[PDB]
Amino acid sequence: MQLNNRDLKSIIDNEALAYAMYTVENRAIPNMIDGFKPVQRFVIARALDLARGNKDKFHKLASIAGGVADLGYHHGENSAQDAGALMANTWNNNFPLLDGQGNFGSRTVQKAAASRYIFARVSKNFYNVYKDTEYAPVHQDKEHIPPAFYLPIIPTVLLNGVSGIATGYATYILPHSVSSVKKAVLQALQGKKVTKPKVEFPEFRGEVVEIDGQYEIRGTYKFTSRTQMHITEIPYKYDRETYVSKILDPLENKGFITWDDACGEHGFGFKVKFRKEYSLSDNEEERHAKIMKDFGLIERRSQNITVINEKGKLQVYDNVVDLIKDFVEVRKTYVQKRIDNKIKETESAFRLAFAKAHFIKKVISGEIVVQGKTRKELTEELSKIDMYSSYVDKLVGMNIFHMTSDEAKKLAEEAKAKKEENEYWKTTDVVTEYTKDLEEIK
């Protein structure tokens, strides 16, 4: 019967600071390295071990969302479903990390089908970029199976565009083209002046420009006749329902136009007819400004780059170039880690393969007689040799066909190739191997 004296201050400080930890473990702010919000990371981890068996197999989004609770997610299966549906489509992502089959929405209608109908899988983009997943930091919480953050080759946070609302913080990052981000990272790796990556919204046929640090997303239109216009594109943030309801429906109610729908496979499209009550200026620039004002093809968006760095701490970046520089510096450490453990693995593989080659040679020529003996005696007589020290289990665990001349030569060549790989790994630095891996992304 031990009695403590914890008083009320300690119990009120533990009743709080546990809600704070709970909200920290799932925050809308994206990580700086892999660009994943916690829910997206859990969905990715789920899709990955669901795709451990068959890589190309689609899985029902319900299974992907329901498996997250085992991994460590606490906010249920609705959030995982929504994150997966938003991550699997190509209309929202410049670099989709989940491949989709089913109705994942489009620019015109942004609602995906019910999660029990649509299927998702990890795309070739993830496996192309997200390398060294083994070397990702282990989470502090032993309950969380997924690592602290995955390790993309390029800063995926800059690719698909991430938005969120947090308690006291707000993030918003515009989508950058994969080519511009890759070029900028290649420049940062070599220490050059990094060119600011050009933003390129996915499946977007319009015009994008930068004004006084504010990004202006321009849509495109064309006049077919004096009183009829064909809208060919509109800014990213509109779908058909919201755009119609918030532009044309009140303007139809006013009586200025009589619009017609023409949106099809080629994204958006609207044929507009101008009434007599509406006034159009003869000057081209003034009329163009009036159209882009009333028809809402001008939108201005600003970047609030607040991301969690590799230390779990909030960091706000003024511009994406600093983000690229910091990410390159962090990923260089993990590339160096990969270099070190790869050196270790190829050294061990070389020693073991050399041992197999020597075993085969001695067996075939005249030296080792397995033709009548006891297994323990054979192990002790081939283990007293210094070379076959800690590989006796693998060395004696060879197969019958290895004794034949062809496989003997094959294993000798394999040992030589392992030596070559060991020398290459030993004689390379972070820059060369990061550059080599920064060449398969498309």
Partner: protein, 273 residues
């Protein structure tokens, strides 16, 4: 008034055929926008379960939002005949694809997916056999889906109504018969051939480049043997078809054109009534 969720075909109410689709959910109609013919493929999404209209008073038929929106989009006034049949006193019979078809001089005959007037077909020099009105088989004539029954004038702006619903239990004990219960208020549509249903495939094969469609499991089991290296994708819902498959299903549709037997007064009470 204007309806927000009224993706609307250009040839709506212009004396031309339309195929207004009533697709469940605003999600699965996302393909329709990119797959429509932009001339005759209107659509209207519906999420939920339409209240039973059998024995249901007309006062809150329009108070109910969805049901009133349907009469708004289709252009129908409840309690009034949708159509207006033109009188006639001549009848013909002819063979079409090896099947005897009974038609009237004022009827419309569909050939290769296009409706042609009987008067215009008679100018094509193909054989017509004239029979007496008392010799016409009314049951067979009313069961012909390639024949339209003497249309003079139509108050609707959409010619047809094609229902698009899920294949699993989310459609079985759902919208599928309730919508027919509502549409029964104008019995002329079913016997005219207007009300239809787009048969969603349930099992799809993936042999070679193209693909095979199995509308129910029995055909899949029967034709499984002749399928070289075939794959299964259980389409238990509309939001399981990719864009191309939905395009093929919309542009080349297969209709279960429902019709009212004389017992339709009864099966609407035996269930859902």
């Amino acid at each position: 008034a204007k309806v927000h969720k009224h993706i609307k075909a250009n040839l709506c109410g212009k004396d031309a055929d339309t195929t207004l689709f009533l697709t469940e959910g605003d999600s699965a109609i996302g393909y329709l926008i990119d797959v429509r013919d932009k001339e005759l493929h209107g659509g209207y999404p519906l999420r939920g379960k339409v209240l039973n209209s059998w024995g249901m008073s007309y006062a809150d038929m329009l108070k109910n939002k969805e049901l009133f929106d349907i009469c708004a989009i289709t252009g129908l006034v409840l309690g009034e005949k949708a159509f207006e049949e033109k009188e006639d006193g001549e009848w013909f019979t002819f063979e079409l694809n090896g099947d005897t078809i009974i038609v009237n001089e004022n009827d419309e005959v569909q050939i290769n997916g296009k409706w042609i007037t009987v008067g215009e077909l008679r100018k094509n020099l193909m054989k017509f056999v004239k029979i007496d009105s008392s010799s016409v088989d009314m049951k067979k004539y009313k069961l012909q889906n390639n024949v339209r029954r003497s249309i003079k004038s139509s108050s609707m702006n959409y010619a047809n109504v094609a229902i698009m619903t899920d294949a699993d239990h989310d459609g079985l004990g759902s919208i599928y018969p309730s919508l027919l219960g509502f549409f029964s208020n104008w019995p002329e549509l079913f016997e005219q051939g207007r009300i239809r249903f787009v048969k969603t495939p349930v099992i799809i094969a993936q042999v070679g480049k193209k693909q095979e469609w199995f509308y129910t499991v029995a055909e899949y089991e029967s034709a499984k043997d002749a399928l070289p290296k075939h794959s299964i994708r259980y389409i238990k819902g509309l939001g399981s078809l990719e864009k191309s498959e939905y395009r093929e299903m919309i542009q080349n549709p297969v209709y279960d054109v429902v019709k009212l037997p004389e017992n339709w007064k009864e099966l609407f009470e035996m269930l859902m009534g």
